[PDB]
Design a protein that fits this description.
The complex is a heterodimer of chains A (101) and B (236). Chain A has 101 residues and is mostly beta strands. Chain A has one domain: Sandwich (Immunoglobulin-like). Helices cover 0% and strands 43% of the residues of chain A. In chain A, strands 3, 4, 6, 7 and 8 form a 5-stranded antiparallel β-sheet that branches. The radius of gyration of chain A is 14 Å and the shape is elongated. By secondary structure, chain B is mostly beta strands. Chain B has a domain of 35 residues: Laminin (Ribbon), CATH 2.10.25. In chain B, strand 13 and strand 14 form a beta hairpin. The longest helix of chain B is centred in the N-terminal third of the chain and has 4 residues. The chains are: A mainly beta (101), B mainly beta (236). The interface between A and B is medium-sized, with 23 and 22 residues. The structure holds a molecule of 3 linked components (NAG-NAG-FUC), 2-acetamido-2-deoxy-beta-D-glucopyranose and calcium ion (CA) (3 copies). The site of one calcium ion has 6 residues of chain B, from loops. Chain A: Belongs to the immunoglobulin superfamily. ROBO family. Chain A: It comes from Homo sapiens (Human). Chain A: It is found in: Membrane. Chain A: This is Roundabout homolog 3.
């Protein structure tokens, strides 16, 4: 009757000027059957809300594209079980997308 | 395209044209009701006990998805949660100048910007190659250097004898050193005062007091050491 546990802190792998790759691990104490993951992004230039950039993700890796050049982003991941969504993962370390020429 | 010919799939199911079959499957957000994925109903994410919407939200079920409205006095964090007070409005920040703030359920969180390190409340600039010779890392990959050095890591010495700068002239020579320079007296000169940042401290010595020749009157000069009666020398 409980949602899954919160995943681990996502890690940033591939950094371009328009996309970013995320890597996270599920919780050692997940507690409930996970069905998918939900990825949320954050940009101080955009606002004070977390945009949901990906849902239904089945692997523990995803490439968030369609981003903006030379902009700071942060990310977090939610697990999804039969009884709802988990607490957010620890927010990823801030990274800045590359610049053009 | 077998699904097009026969093996119909109900409106809530997606027909997947296959080679050896024509299999039905439901659309995302719908749950299969029959054995085969013929007719499927929307899942009710707002059902009793389901926590698809999290803290301080009200759930609204839609065909295939759901949405969460914030409770009236609350402000939104994300599509699934809201908090009571916007705890970091601009110009009042409880975080550092070079830090970020995002709202959390029950407060806020501070994280330092890229290129800085700390705990949000206090952030310090990080320099990858580091600063040297007593320099300071003021910004990300930017070192501030003491007066005598330069370079991206304060590793190059300033040549104060070739940069114009100090005209260590008169009775002294300019001698560069790592970080600074010396103003050392020329031959036949002594330092009068304790020291000086230029050649003004050096003074002529009595260049035959307590030399010359066995039989020679000794005279003084600005840098000279004169002996005459036989030797008639003229030193410097
Ligand atoms: C956040 O950190 C500050 C400063 O801590 C310093 O930075 C750390 C990364 C570590 O290197 C410590 O050893 C450093 O001392 C904490 O603040 C106090 O800050 C005042 C001046 O700003 C300083 O004189 C005190 O020594 C600091 N106290 C301690 C225990 O370091 C601050 O408390 C930290 N905040 C949180 C929430 O932990
Ligand atoms: C070195 O630092 C001096 C200031 O002390 C500055 O005038 C000079 O341009 C710097 N040169 C380089 C190459 O950083
Ligand atoms: Ca629904
Ligand atoms: Ca020098
Ligand atoms: Ca003399």
């Amino acid at each position: 009757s409980s949602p899954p546990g919160a995943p681990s802190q996502p890690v940033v792998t591939e950094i371009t000027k328009n996309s970013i790759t995320l890597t996270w691990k599920p919780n050692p104490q997940t507690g409930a059957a996970v069905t998918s993951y939900v990825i949320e992004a954050f940009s101080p230039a955009a606002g004070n809300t977390w945009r949901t950039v990906a849902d239904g993700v089945q692997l523990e890796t995803h490439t968030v594209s369609g981003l903006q050049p030379n902009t700071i982003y942060l990310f977090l991941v939610r697990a999804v079980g039969a009884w709802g969504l988990s607490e957010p993962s620890p927010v990823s370390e801030p990274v800045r997308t590359q610049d053009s020429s | 395209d077998f699904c097009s010919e026969r093996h119909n799939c109900m409106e809530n199911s997606i027909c997947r044209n296959l080679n050896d079959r024509a299999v039905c499957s439901c659309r995302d957000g719908f749950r299969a009701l029959r054995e085969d994925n013929a007719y499927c109903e929307d899942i009710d994410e707002c059902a009793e006990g389901r926590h698809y919407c999290r803290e301080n939200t009200m759930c609204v079920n839609t065909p295939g998805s759901f949405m969460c409205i914030c409770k009236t006095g609350y402000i939104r964090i994300d599509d699934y949660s809201c908090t009571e007070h916007d705890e970091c409005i601009t110009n009042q920040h409880n975080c550092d100048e070079n830090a970020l703030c995002f709202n959390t359920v029950g407060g806020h969180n501070c994280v330092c910007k890229p290129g800085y390190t700390g705990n949000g409340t206090t952030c310090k600039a990080f320099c990858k190659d580091g600063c040297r010779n007593g320099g300071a890392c003021i910004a990300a990959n930017v070192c501030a250097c003491p007066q005598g050095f330069t370079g991206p890591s304060c590793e190059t010495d300033i040549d104060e004898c070739s940069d114009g700068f100090v005209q260590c002239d008169s009775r002294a020579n300019c001698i560069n050193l790592p970080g600074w320079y010396h103003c050392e007296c020329r031959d036949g000169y002594h330092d009068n005062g304790m020291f000086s940042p230029s050649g003004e401290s050096c003074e002529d010595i009595d260049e035959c007091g307590t030399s010359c020749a066995n039989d020679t009157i000794c005279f003084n000069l600005d840098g000279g050491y004169d002996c005459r009666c036989c030797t008639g020398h003229h030193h410097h």
